[PDB]
Structures are given as structure tokens and as C-alpha cells.
Amino acid sequence: ASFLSSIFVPVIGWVVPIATFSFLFLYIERE
Amino acid sequence: KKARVIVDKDPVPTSFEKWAQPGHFDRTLARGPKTTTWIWNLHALAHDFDTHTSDLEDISRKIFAAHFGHLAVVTIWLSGMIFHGAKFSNYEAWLSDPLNVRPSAQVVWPIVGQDILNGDVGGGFHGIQITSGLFQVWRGWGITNSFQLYCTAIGGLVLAGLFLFAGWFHYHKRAPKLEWFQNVESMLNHHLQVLLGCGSLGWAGHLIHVSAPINKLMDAGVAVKDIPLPHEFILNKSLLIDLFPGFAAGLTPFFTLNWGQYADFLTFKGGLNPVTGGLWMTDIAHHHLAIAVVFIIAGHQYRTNWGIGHSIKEILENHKGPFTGEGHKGLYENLTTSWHAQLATNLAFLGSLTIIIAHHMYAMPPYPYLATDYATQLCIFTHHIWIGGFLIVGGAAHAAIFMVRDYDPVVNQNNVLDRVIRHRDAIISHLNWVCIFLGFHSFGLYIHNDTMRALGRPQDMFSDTAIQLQPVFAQWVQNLHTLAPGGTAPNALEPVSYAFGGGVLAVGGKVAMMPIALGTADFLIHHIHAFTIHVTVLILLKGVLFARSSRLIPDKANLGFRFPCDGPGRGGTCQVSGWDHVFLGLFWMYNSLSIVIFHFSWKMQSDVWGTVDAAGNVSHITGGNFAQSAITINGWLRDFLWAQASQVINSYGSALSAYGLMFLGAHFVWAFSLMFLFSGRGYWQELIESIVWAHNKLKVAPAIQPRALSITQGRAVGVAHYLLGGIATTWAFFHAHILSVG
Amino acid sequence: PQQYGWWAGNARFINLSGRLLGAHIAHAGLIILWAGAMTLFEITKYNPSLPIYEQGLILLPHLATLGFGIGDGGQIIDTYPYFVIGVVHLVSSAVLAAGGIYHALLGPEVLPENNQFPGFFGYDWEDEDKMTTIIGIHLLLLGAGAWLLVAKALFWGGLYDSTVASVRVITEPTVNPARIFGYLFGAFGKQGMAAVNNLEDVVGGHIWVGILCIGGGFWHILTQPFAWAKKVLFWSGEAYLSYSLAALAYMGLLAAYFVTVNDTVYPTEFYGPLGFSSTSGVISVRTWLATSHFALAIVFLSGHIWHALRVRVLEAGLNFEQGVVNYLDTPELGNLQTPINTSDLTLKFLVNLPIYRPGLSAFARGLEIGMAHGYFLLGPFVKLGPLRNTEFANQAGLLATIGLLLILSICLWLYGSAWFQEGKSPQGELPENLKTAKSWSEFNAGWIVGSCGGALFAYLLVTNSS
Amino acid sequence: VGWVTFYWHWKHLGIWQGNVAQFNENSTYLMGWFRDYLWANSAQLINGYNPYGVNNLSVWAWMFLFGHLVWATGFMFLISWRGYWQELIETLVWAHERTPIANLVRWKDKPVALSIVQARVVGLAHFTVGYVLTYAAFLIASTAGKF
């Protein structure tokens, strides 16, 4: 189960920020 | 026209009337106080002579008289230092034993237990150990007794008296007209030839006739009582011949260009006297003679009353090229109609010179028994760096004051000053960038290193044992200066400084000076200096270039030099004034110089200073920990601040206890400053309202209505206590540490 | 002419051919005088006991390497060859001196241009053929001079060799192009052309140089300069001077490097130990030659820059009174016109970058930009990464690069998504074919493909460095 | 809360080490606090990492310096006020517009210096975060180091 750390920590570190900042950027610039 | 003495007689009648009329000098202040803001404004405007009167002649007279005043207080101070040397010191004991006895010229009175501060300083004397280097100055002067200091002190009090009289006389009695003041060519001639040239020739005289002989005998181990008085070397030539055979030749070799006949008392030795670890008096003699000649020649450049010579206006006007339009045309008018333009220049370059002096005096210790007095070395370096940094920021302030008050568009159209104003966005944008680049690629390397060390990855660090950043250029220059004697300086025996290379020179057991090797820690700290200087310049240059206007406030010149803002509009215009850029530049000057004196302190203690074994092995004060520690912030926190603060914090119940108290006191004054800097007037005026209510309630409400400090004064008080507290802390730190280990 | 002051007095006869000629023959004479007179000056104070390198004799080393009166172990046994050479120059100086003073003031101010033989020597700075023929004519004499060194090295005695410390005759010159030109490509050492370690490559080098110079000699006299040369170069008389100064500066630095590192063509028995060496306090001949000609190369580069920038200012129709800093024809606009932002070089370069270059599709712009950025971005990741000192340094670096380029691809998609909002075109200096949502998608597709490719290509070159 | 927690911690450190005397005699003058509490108990914390290696307090040593950095960063927003920054950002806007390849890209939102109130918010946050992390690091490292 320890292997989940190798999946989740990179996701919370990179995937989640990129996805969140990408969406929020597109939302705050929507006209 | 011709330079001539032209003065008005009895321009200002002397009377105590105006002494009894506080704020007489300003029309607004003359009406009297209504609020407590008046009391501050009185002191704030006191020496702002441009606001007293419009007349440039009256301003010039006030400035000339004030200077005699400042010369008088400086002479009183220098006379006091020498008097305290004559009366309340162990100077004579220290002459007999320079290496063992500790210089002290301040004795404390026995009251409330403060006599503890009178520590055992050697020479059967109890007092505060002095770090001003006065003993090394007086030894260099060839002063060998207390009577010579008494004479010099009294002489000073008479000179201070003369300076007071001069200032009163040249204001109240015979005040020069504006014509006199604007003879810049005559002033430069007299100040280059007499003040500097004849001063240097005069001093060469003293060195050659008094200092060099007396110091030579003291270095030969002759007892102070056995050494002849300085006049006996003039009256009895035989004594002087015995030390310097070249005097046998007399003055004929000078007039017949047979100057080699003086090669024994006018030398180009280089390095340091091995007895004292200071520069050779004979090198210093030849320096001051050579300086004197170059100055006396230099000060025949400017045309006065005989056609021969340059006019500075014509020189300036002729220096223009295809990038700079009219070039330096109109700058002569700026520098001869604005006192602020002269004060800007003179503060900028005297400040820059004082920092050069700091560097040149540690690397080439000019006084006998200075190099080994590690307390004096650290303190005079730090002192002169600080004075330098304040003077430079003053330069920028008065440059901004000139731009707001004294700048004329008509005089300065398409000249270098006009054209810098026209690309000021390009200047500040590029300087902004280089500041961020230097910040990232200097400080970011420390953060990289801290993180790598913390993650247990020393191989990934920027260090000598990891990813190296060798300062190859500084390393190459050190080599060139080390190879200079015999090569590109054939008639030099040693290098100018052992800092560049050559051998470890040691006096007593201790290292006077040795080569200061540069590596990754020296590359990193040099790029921190570059960073912190470029950011200070960004702030100050932005202050001067945007003093008159910006894209935000077009009419900023109308608001003046010192105004708090132009209100919360345009998003908020807090600290747009040239004054507020000086305010912010002071913090960055403080930040910059703090890291300079910390760099000096740690590098010297780890890599230069220390004891020397009979075999010749150098054991440094902090055992060369700089290379591996000074490459992380944690290393600075631990191995510098934490480690070396042990002496100041453990000083209570000893002669250094005062530094322990100053250390806390200074930490307090610093923290107190944050009240003024972080808060605003609005809060304090509303608090004063409630306090005024209570005073009204008991019928003790003052007629002079209490007001919270002005927005500008809040900031002025803030930065004042911040600098005082911060600098005083380091002062107490440096002393307590270096008076224990050094 | 008359606008130039006495300080710039030699600029008065730029357009006057006779004075300019007379000046060149006169200065030639001055170089010959020095070469000849200083050879005698050095002969007069040669102590055969002490070595040459720590006496301060510079020309005798140059005569020594050619093998003029030397026995075994680089020992100067006879000095008659130094004297005959010294006097030959020193007399040639007096002949060239005469020629100098004649063409200066006694001769005509302008060399006449006509169909007669005296007409041939006459020239104009605009007629490009005549200068090209002069280039070729003097190139034949550079070739001739290189073949005279070869003839000295092969037939007339030979050259001194530091391997055996004797004056061996050369028989088998290296006529291999791959070997001789390999020096230009840094094949046989890091030092390049200054990495020669035998006379066989030196003679071989001067064969190749000899035939190239003679080959170029025939080319330039029989051909006029083509339309591509007609556009890229400046054609004022000061433009040619600035080019020649760039060459002299390059040659000065070349020889300064040669003498510093090379010991074959500069023997240690004559010039002294390699690098910068001082024996018994005395600075070696090598150090003097190296450091002087290094300093003169920096000066002659400063000469190229000065004369080249002056040409570029004059040809732009700008004077030095109004200057090189102007306004944008609308003074109240932000920017100023400067040689950094408005120079034809700057404008031509920027316009021709893939982002601005006409006739590139949105994809092709992205692709070229991608390839460039993807290529250089590999370096930092490979060489400074955490796995830089492992077997996975290149592979780690490549995956990092692809990684960064994928986030940069998202950044592009975000930038486009933000701006392209139904009709409203993006602000900023875009090309006309990147002002639609589909064109921006193509540009992003271009960037991705380009950047991945650029990274992959750099990786294939890095991993196959063998 | 600084004074409250310092007091709580230094009194307890004495009690936990069976050395109440230290607090009892040195807590009556502020050099005692400075030396016997801050200086004395920083010893292990700041050696969490060093040239010789790392231990389990390396993270607290790093957070300790992080706190000091975030605190100090707060001073910038609290001391230097908006008008300075708005004038600086104006030149950056100029430079972007005039840079030949960079001026390709354009902001949707005009760059402006933080508001007067926002600067007090951001300044006070950096100050607070700095205050908390610095003491959290010191409190934990110094106690966990001894115990």
C-alpha cells in the first residue's frame, strides 16, 4: 500500500495544482 | 572675470534677541506654536536655509558660517580625544609594550557600581579599552609622552576657538558676496594646492623629519625615555644621519635631480615593517611627497586671474558626443547655482572614498601595531564603511532635493541630465531586472545550499567540495598584484598588500596580514554585495529620476521633495516623494553594509587573523570555518551570529558588561522602531484625542494642542531608531567579541 | 577633407589615392627600418654564453627558428646570416622611404584612372572590381611568400626542429587535407592550429595556405563580386579599413595564442619556457611577444569596432551632431529610436525570426520556435540535475526537458484560451496569422512537436558523442 | 502570546531538567531570557544540519530559517508602501511593451501595486506565518532535542 505515496504525493504536488490553477486562470479571465 | 575678496561689512547685527524667538528664521514658525507639530517643524527646518530666505547670497553666507561651526565642534572633539589621551589613558605604558598593553583612554567614575567597566587593560591602568586606533595614530605621529598630547589638545582648543570666531566673523562682521563663493576655479586651485598639496607636503615634512626617525628608533627597541625629542633630529643632524645616511647629502641632491641620494628615507619598499606590522614610514614619507607634487601641479589647472588655466565651463561644454546630445553643457550652472548639486556630488564621492579608505586601511595597515590590534582593525573598517554608506545615501537625497528645487529646464535642455530624465523608464526597468537577476543568482544559491545541506545532499551544493563557483577574475588579479614587485612594479620589494599574496607576515605571535584566498564562499558573498548595492542604487536612482514627476503623479515637483503621498487615489500614492526613496534606500544601505561588515568580520577571523606557531603554522580565530559554513544562511546564523554572540551575552559581571547592556538596549531601540514603521498617524491622533479628553477632564489640557507625529516624521523616527538600534547592536556584538578573541 | 582637424589629419586623403598610396609605402619603410635596424641592434649585444630568451632579443629568435647559422642543441655559431638579413631590410627601408616621400607630396594628389598602364594603378572606392583585383594581386604574393618558406624548409637548408634540437631538412610534407584542416576543427588537441607538434604539419600547412592564397589570387582578379556580397557589406573606403582592422586583430590574437602555448614553431631554447616565465628576474622573450601582441590585438579589435561603427552611422544618413538617438516620428510615443531597437540589423533579424517571419504557417512558426527552445533546454537538466553524475544523467535530463516543455505547452493553451473569447483578438505584437483560435492551436501543436523533437535531437547528439 | 509561551516553555524546561534554579535566578533580568532561553536552547536546533551532516532536527532547522525569512518578508509590505511600487511597476509595464519578442504576449489584467489595505493584510500575514513557524520550530526542536 506504501506505493500509493508514489502516486498521491506527485498528484497533490503537480496534477492538482496545474488542474486547479489552469481552471481558476480560465475562470478569472472568462468574459 | 577676476577672482577677488569682496565682502559686505556688518551684514547681520549680533544680538541674543533672536535666541529668545524660537522659529524666527521661518515666516510660518515666526507666528509661534499652535500645535506640537510646530516644535518638530522648528528642528526639521532649522538648517534648511533655502526655506529661510530666497537670496542665494544670504544662503551661501549661512552655509559658510555654519561650516566654521562644524569645524569648531570637530576640532573640540579631536582635541578632546587627544586630551583624554594625555590625561586619562595608558598611552605611555602602551608605547613601552604595544603587544601586551591594551589601549584605553576612557576612565569611568565609581558610582552605582559602574566602575566594573574600568577593566585591567595592562600598564597598571584601569579603564575602557578604546577601539578608535588613536594610540596607533599618535605612535605614527611620533608622539612619545603625555606633554606632547597636552600641547596638541590645547592647540586644538585654540583652533576650535579660531573656527568659532571665523564663523561668527564671516557671518556677522565680514560676509563674502555671492561673487566670492562662485569662484569655483580659484577654490579648486587653493583646495588642491594648499589644503591637499601643501598639507601633504607639510605632512611629508613631519614624516621625514619627526615620525620616521622616532619610529625607526622605537622599532630598534630603544626605550621611549632614551629616544631624542623630535626637535633634536633637526638641531642635532648627527642623530638623524645615524638613522638615515641620505641626510649627509643635504638639500643639493633635491635641486640637482640626484634624488637617488634620498633612497634610504624615501623608499618604495611595499609590504609592512616586520617589527610593527604597519606600512614603512619611509614609504609613507615618499607617498605624501609624491602626492604633494601631483596636487600642487594639479591645482594649477584652473584659470583664476592670469589667463593661463582651464575654465571648467568650457571643458564641460566641449565634452559632448553622438549619444549625449549637448553632453555636459548646463552642468556648470547646476553646480554653481545649486548648493544641493554640490552637496549631492560631495556626499556621493566622499562616501565612496570613505569605503575605499576602509578597504585600503585593513589590507595595508598604515599605523604601527594596528594590524595585530584586531579590535581596532575590525572597528575602524566597520566605522568607515558605515560613515561611507550614510554619506552616499545623503548624496542621493541632496541629488533628489536638487531635482525638485534647483533643477532648471532651460539650463538643462538636451544635456546629459535632460537625456537621462528622458530614458529614466529604460534605466530603472533595466536596473530593476539586474537587481532581480542578482537577487536570484546570489541569494537563491544560499537557499539552494541551505536546502541541499538540510536534505543531506552536500554533493549538490554550491561549494569548493561540490559545484564550485571560483572567482577566477579576482583570483587572476590577486596573482598579478603578487607578481608586481620585480615585474610590472620593478622598484617594489614586496606587494602593496600581503592580502593579494606573498607570505604570512606575523608581529608578536599574531598574524598582521596574510593572503586572503577567494573561493566559492567569496564568489557568493561578492555577488550578494553586488546585489545589495544595485538594489540600494535602484531605490535612490528611482528617487532622483522620478522626484519631479512620474506616470502616476505628473506634478510631483509642486508637491515638493518631502511630502507623505498624494492620497489613497490612483490605487494609493504612499511614499512617491524623493524623500521616501531616501527613507527606503537607508534600510537597503543598512542591509547592504551589514552584510559587508559581517563578510569582513568572519572572513578575517577564519582566513587571515590568528596566532602563528614558531614553525610558522597559522591557527585562525575561527579555524577556517568560512569556506564550508558561509555558503548557507544556517551557517551564518550558527557559526557567525550564534557562535560569536557568546562573548556579548556572557559579558555581565565583567568589564565588557556595558557591551552586553548596549546589545540588549540596541535590540530594544530596533524593535521600538517597528511601532513607527508599521503604524500610521491616524491611529495615534485618535488615541491622543482620548488622552487629551482626560487632560481636559482634569483641566490640564495644554495650549499647544498635542498632535501625532507627521506621516513623514513617523517614517523619519522609524528609520532613525531602526538604523540606531540595528547598527548599535552590531557595534556591541563586534566590540564584545573582538575585545575577547582579537 | 578640410573638415578634419590636424589630430584626424590622415583622414583628409581618404578619397585622394596618391597621398594614401605614398602613406602606405612610407609606413612599409618604417616597419622595414625597424626590422632591419633592430636586427643589427640585437646582433651588437648578443652574449653567446647567456641564453637568448633572458637577454631581451626578439628578432634573433625569429631568424633562429628558420635555421640561419645554428649547430647542434640550438647554439648560434655564425651571425653573418642575421647581418645580411638585417642590412637587406635596412637598405629596402631606404628604397621604400624614397618611394613614400615621392608619392606623398611630389607625385600627384589623385592617381589618374585611364586605359594606359599608369591608369591601372588609379582606383575609386565605388568600383568594386578594381579592389577585388588588388586583393587577388597581393594574395598571389602572400602565396609566393608561403612557398618561399616551404622552399627554405625543403631545398635551402631547412628549419630548426625542437624535437632533436637541430636544423633538419624537410623532405615529406603533410599534403593530407584531413590532417592539416583538422587543426581548424580542433581534431589534434584543444589548442587547435596552435597544437602543431612537428615541422611536417607546419610545412604541410604552408603548402595548403600557399595554394589557397594563389587559388584565391586567380579567383579575385578574374571575377567581380556577386549580388549577395553587394548587399551584406559596406563599400566606403573606411569600410575596407575596418574589415582589415578586424583581420589584423584576429591575426594578432592568433599569434599571441601561438607564442603562449606552442613550442614547436617557437622553440624554448630561443623564446624560453611555455606560458609566462621570468628567469633570474628577467622577463622571457615569449612573455614579451605574447603579452604585447595580445594587448595590440585588443587595441586593433577596438580599431575595427570604432571604424566599423563610424561607417554604419555615416551609411545610415546620420551625422555626429544630431547623433544616433531620435524620436519615433511621433515624439509623444513612449519608446526612443536607438541603435539597439531601430538599427537595420536589429529590425532585419527580429522580422526574420520564426514568430515574425513572413510566409510561415502558424504550425511552422511553433515548430521552429519549439525545435530551438527544446534543443537548448536539454543542457541544464542533463548536466546540473540530481542524477548528473550517474549513468541515467542524459535520460533523466531528457524526461525533465519533455516535462518542462509539456507545462510550457499548457501555458500556451491557457494563454490562447484566455485571449481567444469569440471575436476579441489577443493584444500584443502578434503576426497576422496567430490572431485566430485555430491558428493558436496549430501554433501550440507546432511548439509541442518542435520542442519534443528539439529535445530528442539534442539527446541523440549528447548520448552519441563518439 | 510570545511572552506567555516563552515563560511557559522556559519555566517548564527548568522543571523538566530538574533545574528550576536556572529560571528562578535568571528570569528577573532580560539578558537571562536572551542567553539562558533563546541562545542556550537554539544550540541543537541550528545544528539540525551543518557541514558535518544532518539529524532528525534538520526539518526544524530549515523551518526555523523559513520562519525568519517569511517574517522578514512581511517587513517589506509593512515598511515600504504602495506609491513606491506603483511607480516601479509602471517602468516594468514600459519595458514589457518595448521588449521586441516579449511584447508578443500581453496581460489580460493591468499590473498594479497591491492596495494600501492589501499590503497591510499581506504584510501582517507574512509577519504572523513567520512568527508561528519560527517559534513552532524552536519550541519543538529545543524540547525534542533534549527529550
Ligand code: CLA
Ligand atoms: C510537491 C510535490 C513535488 C514532487 C513529488 C517533486 C518531485 C521531484 N522534483 Mg521537486 N520541486 C517541487 C515540488 C515537487 N517535486 C517544488 C514546489 C519546487 C520549487 C521549490 C521543486 C523544485 C525542484 C528542483 C529545482 C528540482 C526538483 C526535482 C524533482 C525530482 C527529483 C527526483 C530525481 O532525482 O529523479 C530524476 C527525475 C527526473 C529527471 C524527472 C522525472 C520525470 C518528470 C517528473 C516528469 C516527466 C513527464 C510527465 C510524465 C508529464 C509532464 C510533467 C507534469 C505535468 C506531471 C522529482 C521528480 C529535480 C529534477 O529532477 O527536476 C526535473 C530538480 O532539479 N524539484
Ligand code: CLA
Ligand atoms: C527577507 C526579507 C525580504 C525579501 C526576501 C525581500 C525581497 C525583495 N525586495 Mg524587499 N524589502 C524588505 C525585505 C525583503 N525584501 C524590507 C524589510 C524593506 C523595507 C525597507 C524592503 C523594501 C524594498 C524596496 C524599496 C525594494 C525591495 C526590493 C526587493 C526585491 C529585490 C529583487 C530580488 O532580489 O528578487 C529575487 C527574489 C528574492 C531574492 C526572494 C527569494 C527568492 C527565492 C529564494 C527563490 C524562489 C523560490 C521558489 C521558486 C518559490 C516559489 C515556489 C512555491 C510557490 C512552491 C526582492 C523581491 C526591490 C525591488 O523590487 O527591485 C527589483 C526594491 O526596490 N524591497
Ligand code: CLA
Ligand atoms: C536561484 C538560483 C538557483 C540556481 C542557479 C540553482 C541551480 C540549481 N539547482 Mg537549485 N534551488 C534554488 C535556487 C537555485 N538553484 C532554490 C531557491 C530552491 C528551493 C529551496 C532550490 C531547490 C533545488 C532542488 C530540490 C534541486 C535544485 C537543483 C539545482 C541544479 C539543477 C536545476 C536545473 O536542472 O534547472 C534547469 C534550469 C533551467 C532549464 C533554466 C536555465 C536558465 C538559462 C541558463 C538562462 C539563459 C538565459 C540566457 C543566457 C539569456 C538569453 C540568451 C540570448 C542568446 C538570447 C542547479 C545547479 C537540483 C540539483 O540536483 O542540484 C545539483 C535539485 O534537485 N535546486
Ligand SMILES: CC1=C(/C=C/C(C)=C/C=C/C(C)=C/C=C/C=C(C)/C=C/C=C(C)/C=C/C2=C(C)CCCC2(C)C)C(C)(C)CCC1
Ligand atoms: C595635529 C594637530 C594639530 C597640529 C598640527 C600642526 C602642528 C600642523 C603644522 C603644519 C605645518 C608646520 C605645515 C607646513 C607646511 C609647509 C609647506 C607646505 C611649505 C611649502 C614650501 C614650498 C612649496 C617651497 C617652495 C620653494 C621655495 C620657497 C624656494 C625654492 C623652490 C621651492 C619650490 C622648493 C593642532 C594643534 C592644530 C590640533 C589638531 C591636531
Ligand SMILES: CC1=C(/C=C/C(C)=C/C=C/C(C)=C/C=C/C=C(C)/C=C/C=C(C)/C=C/C2=C(C)CCCC2(C)C)C(C)(C)CCC1
Ligand atoms: C551569439 C549571438 C546570437 C546567437 C546565440 C544563440 C541564440 C545560440 C543558441 C542556439 C540555439 C538555441 C540553437 C538551436 C538549434 C536547434 C536545433 C539544431 C534543432 C533541431 C531539431 C530537430 C532536427 C528536430 C527533429 C525532429 C522533430 C522536429 C520532430 C520529430 C522528431 C525529430 C527528431 C525528427 C544571436 C543570434 C541571438 C544574436 C547575435 C549574438
Ligand SMILES: CC1=C(C/C=C(\C)CCC[C@H](C)CCC[C@H](C)CCCC(C)C)C(=O)c2ccccc2C1=O
Ligand atoms: C507611537 C507613534 C506616535 C505617537 C508618538 C508621539 C506623538 C511622539 C511623542 C513623544 C514625545 C517624546 C513627547 C514629549 C513631550 C514633552 C516634550 C516631554 C516633557 C517632559 C521632559 C522635559 C522630561 C505617532 O504620532 C506616529 C505618527 C506616525 C506614524 C507612527 C507613529 C507612532 O508609531
Ligand code: SF4
Ligand atoms: S495611507 Fe497615509 S501615506 Fe498612504 S495615501 Fe493614506 S495618508 Fe497618504
